[PDB]
Design a protein around this ligand. Sequence first.
Ligand SMILES: [Zn+2]
Length: 257
Amino acid sequence: HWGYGKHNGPEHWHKDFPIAKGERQSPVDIDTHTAKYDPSLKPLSVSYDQATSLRILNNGHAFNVEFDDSQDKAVLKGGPLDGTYRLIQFHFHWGSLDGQGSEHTVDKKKYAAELHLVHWNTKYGDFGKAVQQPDGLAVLGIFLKVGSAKPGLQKVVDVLDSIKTKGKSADFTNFDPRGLLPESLDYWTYPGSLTTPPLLECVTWIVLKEPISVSSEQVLKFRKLNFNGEGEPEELMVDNWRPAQPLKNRQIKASFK
Ligand SMILES: [Zn+2]
């Protein structure tokens, strides 16, 4: 089935998921000289004070940190959004080397990794309904560069040994996602898709301009994870990123000058 290899990677996905070649696929290259400032865009409201993490799972493609989304505890609003979007999970994409790993690119620059905080529009009642709608999800994307350690990431890094292989999960309570955010909330926004199958065109992307810094040791621990299940041939979980897709008939808007 689908993955990130020669035989089942991004270049193959369109045979199972023909929407791969659609009009609003993600990620994209952000060309900072053609993104237009939109003074009508509001500041982003990220309200994570009551966020309730539950569990961390190796799904064979990444690891997901999952949240209780059964009430309005952690929500994204404002910016380009109408209405309220509830946090359900976050995950990352990363490289085998520090020079690649991000999904979005900025003027063709690849970062070492990219964090995705996934939120669903409460007017659709649940996640599965929301992904069927063009405004169903809002994904906050944050780039990671290698430099100083990110203290707020360490709790994640130190549980990874317990979820090494596909299908493994661990309790992951009381994790505060505010510690993964950069200082500035300046962003770019555009309409797009999920970046993994089923590649549904349901996402308002909100990509922050300012990266976070993580240390080489932190990223090294991500690269020890496995795509495989326990007692299968080891295949390191690296390069779990989809390359940039054609922008087509879209505009990328900036919240800042
Ligand atoms: Zn993602």
